[PDB]
Amino acid sequence: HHDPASDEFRKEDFPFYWLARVHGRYTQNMERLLKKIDLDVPRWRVLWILNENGESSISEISTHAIAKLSTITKIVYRMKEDGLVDTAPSPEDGRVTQVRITEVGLQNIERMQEVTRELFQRSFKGLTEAQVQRLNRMLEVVFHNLETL
Amino acid sequence: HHDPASDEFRKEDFPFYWLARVHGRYTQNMERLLKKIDLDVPRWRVLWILNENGESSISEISTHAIAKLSTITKIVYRMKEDGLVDTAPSPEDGRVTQVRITEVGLQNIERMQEVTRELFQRSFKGLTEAQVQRLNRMLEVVFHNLETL
Ligand SMILES: O=C(O)Cc1c[nH]c2ccccc12
Ligand SMILES: O=C(O)Cc1c[nH]c2ccccc12
């Protein structure tokens, strides 16, 4: 039922169908919420990456934000204009740009934590903490499977 | 660990992080494969929707392909030029465009079934049929949860 090469294929039994539907609805709702505090999904991701990893290159940010280097560069310098991040040439390689979050960026993290609280309360309604962890593990397994292609 | 409002938040424990990573890697690999037979992810989706549901409006296609009505309209008339679909005004409402798959579209379905076979063999490696069904059910639950916002 979940095999596109089968005659029994049904999108409603196809994990990637519901994955894409979830990605789209989640993205739309997050864009709506973050707009209220002058943010968006790419800047939400960049801020979380900087908050977890400290100083980060454009390349590392791009990997974890799922965006092109050009997109991340534009977003990063926009955030720097707004005061949310600062940048500096990497000492190892002047070609490589290092980005770090500012105290204003951290305040923006607090704002995005508050404004999305209800969405994340609702998102996993009906699922236990073990079920959520199992969802997470299975998604990571699929990701690693796709990295072998 | 999976709660963005928590001090313990870690993206690697956050279902939406792995969901987005999977969506991106899956999309890139599918684009690569479908390009070999002159297709892409949006046309793969449109063909599956038409193959399952028969004659379908632009709106229904757009819902299930996760795209804007304008995007789907352009894709649909491109596919019609290439002979993969045909269109007709809906009898109920001349404003509404009905799309149906052609025998050439069905042949393209067979080609996309063949060219992605290995990706789908690899995608669920290490997961049993029950685990895949549980992944599917949990994703549908999250989707329905997000529809309440
Ligand atoms: O791109 C994918 O394979 C997932 C997907 C999203 N909408 C779809 C409609 C029909 C079949 C698959 C999909
Ligand atoms: O948009 C999301 O919430 C998922 C996501 C993708 N990359 C991320 C990096 C850090 C935190 C969340 C995400």
- Crossing angle of helices A15-35/A103-115, nearest 10°? 120
Q: What is the CA radius of gyration of chain B?
A: 18
Instruction: Give the ranges where chain B is alpha helix by DSSP (H).
Output: 15-35, 41-53, 58-65, 69-81, 103-115, 117-123, 129-146
Strand-strand pairing, B85-89 and B56-57: unpaired
- Contact of A127 with chain B, judged by CB distance below 8 Å, is answered with yes
How many CB atoms are located within 10 Å of the residue B48 CB? 21
- Cβ distance A87 to A97 under 8 Å? yes
Where exactly are the structural domains of chain B?
1-35, 40-146
| CA dist list (Å): B8 to B15, B19, B32 | 15, 20, 37
**Counting atoms of ligand 2 from 1, which one is nearest the CA of B21?**
6
- Contact of B71 with chain A, judged by CB distance below 8 Å, is answered with no
Say whether domain A40-115 belongs to CATH 1.10.10.10. Answer: yes
Calculate ∠ Cα B133-B136-B142, nearest 5°.
145
d(CA B65, CA B52): 13
| CA dist list (Å): B121 to A142, A145, A148, B22 | 11, 10, 12, 16
Can you read off the two tokens belonging to residue B103?
């025998």
Tell me how far apart the 2 most distant CA atoms of chain A are, in Å. 57
Can you read off the two tokens belonging to residue A148?
């072998």
What is the Cβ-side half-sphere exposure of residue B67, based on CA atoms within 13 angstroms?
A: 20
List of residues 6+ apart from B60 with CB closer than 8 A: B49, B53
Exposure pattern of A14-50 as b/e (b: 16+ CB <10 Å)? bbbbbbbbbbbbbbebbeebbeeeebebbbbbbbbbb
The one-letter amino acid at B35: K
Phi, psi of B83 (to 5 degrees): 90, 5
How many CB atoms are located within 10 Å of the residue A6 CB? 11
Class of domain B40-146 as given by CATH: mainly alpha
How many CB atoms are located within 10 Å of the residue A121 CB? 12
- Cβ distance B83 to B43 under 8 Å? no
Q: List the beta bridge partners of residue A88.
A: A98
Calculate ∠ Cα A121-A125-A127, nearest 5°.
125
Can you read off the two tokens belonging to residue A19?
């994955």
Smallest CA-to-CA distance from A21 within B62, B4, B124 is with B62
Task: Indicate the length of chain B as a whole number.
Answer: 149
Method: X-ray
Q: Which among B26, B116, B140 is the nearest to A4, CB-wise?
A: B116
Instruction: Give the ranges where chain A is alpha helix by DSSP (H).
Output: 15-35, 41-53, 58-65, 69-81, 103-115, 117-123, 129-146
- Ligand 1 pocket check: which of B26, B63, B64 to mutate, most ligand atoms within 8 Å of Cβ? B64
d(CA A99, CA A79): 10
d(CA A130, CA B142): 15
Smallest CA-to-CA distance from B48 within B34, B35, B65, B31 is with B65
d(CA B21, CA A136): 12
> For residue B11, how far is its CA from the centre of ligand 1 (angstroms)?
26
List of residues 6+ apart from A46 with CB closer than 8 A: A61, A65, A72, A75, A76, A79, A85, A99
CA A52 to chain centre: 13
- Cβ distance A149 to B119 under 8 Å? yes
Can you read off the two tokens belonging to residue B91?
């009898």
CA A103 to chain centre: 21
Phi, psi of B81 (to 5 degrees): -55, -45
